[PDB]
Symmetry: C7
Subunit: 280 residues, 7 copies
């Protein structure tokens, strides 16, 4: 029992190697496994770091951002290696992994702003509330869609502007649509003076909305007195047309109204006001 | 004791195999179990990845999204396999699973935006605050419902537009309804000049709302002076009718009012203003 | 020592079965317990799945939703069985249960939108801020309550509309009430011209509010000049009445005011304006 | 060694009972402890369930809610018993308690809406920002408090309405008060014409606010030209009075102003406007 | 070996007490330690409960709230004792402490509403953005501070009202101040007619702001044409004065302006309007 | 057995060193490992603290902030060392690391406000919704971008002001753009009197928009009556031009309109009003 | 074997001390280590409490707050000591540390309101979006900065008021600046009558903006008809100047405009209105 005579006291049948080689070899495999973990983590960090820098230099990137992310991944793998080795050698790594988990939860609550956009993009792809050429209205901005991507949706406004809008923002609102339904409805409102005959007005409006051709006849065509107003009675007029003709139908019916009324004698009224004069 | 004479020092009755075969076999089963876990995880990842790609190619999908999700599931199973093998061989995997849990919590807080819509859809299906043809009002947008799905509700507005609205957004508001109650109430407001006799006005309005037929008589029929205003006294008129007749009753009573008043002599007043003239 | 001679090397007194049967039997009970867990979880999943599908087919449900939830419960029990068996056989299931807990927290943060409504319904039931027939005002919508349920409250608006409103939304606002207090107060506001005598006006208003009978006399009855205005001085009038008579008292007093003032000579004024004329 | 000869192979000095009775008895105490846990949890669930149903049937409750909560508590204790027994017998219950903790966190984030009200009620009780009869203003609603409870505060508005307002909502706003300070200040604003003498106006207003008696004299009494306006110069008037006299002081001073000005010659001006006439 | 012959089967050299007294004594110390924990927790709960009820009966409290909190603390210590004893005897208490932690997190997310106010009060005490007599403006409410406490800040409004405002609400806004800076600036705006000479106006305003004495002369004194308006050109006037004189300087300069302009001939203009007359 | 005779009682074959040297050496390696951890953590804290202070003194920093962060890192490493040593010696460090994790989660929820900006900056760099010279509109503020950094985006407003805007704020809104699309559209609105001939107006506007050269002819050119208004009928005019010419095209067409209309006879109308005169 | 004969039954070769001294000494070191932990925690709590009270009495503090925080730290260390001792003696401290972690998370979610301000202050120091004397605009409040501290930013408004604004509030908004860019742009808007010649107006404005000297000539100088309005056509005028001259340039150009136009004959128009007279 050489190690028994080298340093430790005998104290009588104290053959500590025969009953301690298990623990000694446990320490040995601990330090050797620590070495192996360190060296393997080192070489794997090098390999994966250069590999990601390569496979990122191909696609559109920035140089400083590339170096930043590559070194970030390198240091992350290095930190995992170091923590694993510390745990393997005997140090209670509970605190370092507790603060590591706190930091990870922080990063997650940070990325939450964009992971939502990614998920919403996936859902808009799989459910298809609209296609590329579809003319839509996403939360107050209306214009022909141009493309749907993973993080955002590009749509050209009717004035030529190009709006990039994030997906997570539109999936949480009313996705109105305009090319889904083929036939839609216009709504004129024609305030006239209070002395105008109602029969004549309704006759004129019915003749006008009958003479038209893009106006669908197999549906409702309303010409009713809708409201007694401050200076004028308002007539509502509702007619249906295809999604294509809508605006031109509006303009044509509107100019025909402007001509027919002035031909008949019906008068659009200026804002009226009654004054009671009294000198002082 | 061959292994005793090969490398390790004797130190006297140091028969380390006889008292260490347990730990040696523990290491052996550790590495073998690691092998088995790796190979089984590999083949299971392959099988399940091709199976999900198949069973997704049937339904409506996108090719790149299909590949993305299939490879995602493959790599997820691979990562679980790798972590399990690391833990089985002896590496403290606490840190890697801590950051994994952080990432999972991040993904959960991301999907929270749509899981809510899914749950709200389930609840609207099971409780039925409205059916398909039901004409409803969900948070400021009113129109005939068309369908109720897992993630959204489609309803055709009265103008033909088709609004897709998420479920989680309507279950958190007042779900007004219009075809639930069969009989509803109109409310006219008729401002008249300040010199008009009140008895004559109430007589006329009562005659009008008695002559009608779609007006339910077994309920309240109110014609009362409601408010002394800036240029006119306002009369409120409340009558009940079935949900179908409502709008036509409104229009008919309104035109009858417009005719009867002008027949009698009652005058709707223009906005009045009194001026005190004084030259300078 | 048969197993000693079959495969493993002797190395001298290496009787590995005599000192390893404990670990061998540990492995044996591990695999057998895994088998038992799998089979028991299978049969229990089948039984409970068919039982829940039965006990749900009775109440009002949807077929696809029934199948969805039944298969969901089946797969949940199956997953718990599989994880338990993996843990029992020797695989470190820490990562799979970490991501499982992340998913569970996600589902909880999702259901948070409706669990709140459930709890608020419980509280409104146990505390009773209003009963069925009680006429209330819950956050800007006023109308007779119809029923109080676990998830929502139905109340018929004064116009016949039926509003379904979630509980969690009303318990976080001012629950005004109207049938709790038997006696309430009206408030007229009568702007008169600037030259009218104040004594005459207050005399007239006091005579009017004394002649009435539904007006409680044992409380305050206010007729005071309240404000010098742009074209008129405003008199406030406050009187008390039972919750039933309130509106009819309002209408009757209002018409009596309109008659008495025009009988006396007091004049409600049109919006006045003084102009300084100067030709150019 | 009977059990040695019954089933297990000898393999030489393989006396597995002598060296395995510890583990056998461990299994035995495991299953027996499982039995004891199950039976004790059963009887305790029964006892506590009937006890809570009894002690809840006394106070104001609902029958279905009583049964719901009693069965809820029963099943909760049963689930805890089952999980404890599973853990005691050898099944890794990590996953079931992980999802249980997820569900518990969900329920907590749900109850968060009302636990806050409970805590705020405790704080309003212990700090006393107002008492029962105190006339307060809690976030835009002003009226005499009636009672303060654990979850809400009842206050009768000045119009007789009874508002129930949650505690957690008022502790997060400005708790204005009106009976805390005994003496408060009024503020008149008297726009007069642009040609009126300032000395005469200030003399009149000072005489008026000196003749009064409820107006505290030992404090500031302001009559200053405050603003040159569009059609009138505005005088501010600030006087102090006890919290009781405030409104009557306001009304009396206001009528005295209306009388004194018309006696003197000062003129309240109608909205003025200068027009430049030009024929076309 | 008495216990060997009493119940358990011999099976040959099965001396189970000699090799099981360790586990038997483990069970013994388990049950005895459980007893000790229960009794000690009981007596400590009694002592601490009566002690807290005593030391709370001194300060201002409510009786029912005192009993509530004392029994709450008692039951909390009792629950901790019970859980500790269960864990000590052998029951896996993981689930009960999981739901306990869920409940604790719920209570924490509840108290979050007031812990913030406590912390903000600490910070306002240690940093002193204002003192007791300091006249401040905390988020739209301006008035002399009266006291700063742990949970709220009391400040008497300029009208005598006493506002209690929570600390956590003011530390998250702009803490304007008025007695910190000794000298401040007024700003008049004097719209005059469009035909008035600019030199005369600037001369008059400069004479006025030079004649004053509380107006600091060593700083800027601005009289510039600031804006061409709808009916008048506006002159800005900026002068500096001590925080005390500010309001009286304003009133005095304003009345001096009103007198000097009317003495000179400059005319404040009524709202002008040009009309184009045309008979029909 | 010296240690057997020194202090501990014999009690018969109680050779406690021979059977306790394992535990004694466990204690020894515990205290020695604690020493090593303390000294290594000390020297590493010193080295890394001075190294970070050096490598931070180079870049732009503040002295007190440098010392603050260096001492912060030093104390952090010291605390981790202390906790590791406590765990290694035998103290249950569960509570200290629990509160440490609570503090870490607090710091993470604090930094969440800026980590989001960092991530959004990364995304704007990698996706490039705009470049340096690109003239954009980020959430209501429009102006030429100047640079894009890790935390903020600098853009010079059209008035010369320089706005620093955080990244996390713009990635959550509509990133409008103006130099992406080369050709855009103007929109004039020309209200004319009600008696003007429509044919003449449309002829004039068409001649004007044909005479121009920067107006793209291969696209739509709209001159339609768009709306009957209160005092005027409005004509819409839509023309396309390159992003460069847009504003000058607007100004030139506008002045040409102003000249051509006044040349023809078309009259822009003043706000009209009809008055009903009646003496009192 | 004395302890064998004292209390425990023999049962045959039941030498429980020889085979139980390990566990007895484990209990002994448990209780002794508990003692040591208690006494060391006591003395360390005393030392650190008096030390922090001393090192806080130096800097500006409050007495009651000092005692509060010192006793808080004392009791915190005492609680950690007690929990450590309980764990060391054998009590399962899982529940107490679970509720402790819940409380810690509560305190963290409380301090989150101010930790954010601290971090934002660090970032504003290190990035320097503005310096001390820099005149900035932070979220709607504009004025010369006075100092930047760890928790707040002090800036003197242009009227002398001193606003304390928290850092976390400004780092989340548009940090406009005014002394960063040396040269900025004014923008006049001069509505003139509809009959004024455009050539004369543009000539006059160009002469005016050429005669000036602080107006940078090497940049754009715009005088264009910008809008046809209700009663006037508006001319925009854009000129550049150094950040210093800006306001004086504005005032001087404005007065020069007012003089030159009135010299030429151009007329600023009063709000126009056309009336259609008709007697009744
Ligand atoms: C999405 C899911 C991703 C999951 C990622 C990975 C998925 C890939 C899965 C891979 C699982 C298969 C790999 C083998 C398992 C490791 C063997 C082992 O642990 O040895 C251990 C013992 O166990 C034994 O010694 C005997 C075990 C025989 C294994 C062969 C039967 C597999 C039973 C299949 C059962 C159903 C499997 C269902 C599969 C679908 C080593 O000895 P020990 O130290 O005493 O062990 C401690 C045990 N203890 C903790 C209880 C104390
Ligand atoms: C008994 C063998 C395994 C012992 C180690 C288990 C460590 C588990 C750590 C889990 C950490 C989860 C952090 C989640 C953060 C959101
Ligand atoms: C006793 C055998 C199992 C010991 C290991 C159990 C580890 C459990 C880890 C649970 C981690 C949950 C993280 C949740 C994050 C949202």
């Amino acid at each position: 029992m050489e190690d028994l005579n080298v340093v430790d006291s005998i104290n009588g049948a104290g053959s500590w190697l025969v009953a301690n080689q298990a623990l000694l070899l446990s320490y040995a495999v601990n330090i050797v496994a620590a070495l192996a973990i360190i060296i393997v983590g080192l070489i794997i960090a090098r390999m994966i770091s250069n590999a990601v820098n390569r496979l990122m230099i191909s696609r559109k990137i920035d140089a400083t951002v590339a170096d930043f992310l590559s070194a970030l991944v390198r240091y992350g793998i290095i930190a995992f290696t170091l923590i694993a080795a510390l745990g393997r050698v005997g140090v209670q790594t509970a605190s370092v992994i507790a603060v590591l988990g706190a930091a990870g939860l922080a990063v997650g609550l940070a990325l939450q702003g964009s992971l939502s956009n990614l998920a919403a993009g996936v859902l808009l792809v799989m459910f298809r509330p609209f296609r590329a050429g579809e003319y839509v209205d996403l939360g107050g901005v209306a214009g022909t869609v141009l493309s749907v991507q993973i993080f955002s949706t590009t749509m050209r406004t009717a004035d030529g502007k190009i709006i990039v809008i994030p997906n997570g923002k539109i999936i949480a609102g009313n996705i109105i649509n305009f090319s889904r339904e083929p036939v839609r409805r216009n709504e004129f409102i024609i305030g006239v003076a209070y002395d105008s005959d109602i029969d004549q007005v309704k006759q004129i409006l019915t003749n006008i909305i009958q003479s038209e051709d893009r106006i669908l006849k197999d549906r409702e065509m309303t010409v009713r007195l809708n409201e007694l107003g401050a200076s004028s009675i308002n007539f509502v007029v509702r007619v249906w047309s295809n999604s294509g003709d809508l605006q031109n139908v509006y303009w044509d019916v509107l100019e025909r109204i402007k001509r027919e009324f002035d031909a008949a004698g019906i008068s659009f009224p200026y804002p009226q006001m009654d004054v009671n004069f009294k000198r002082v």
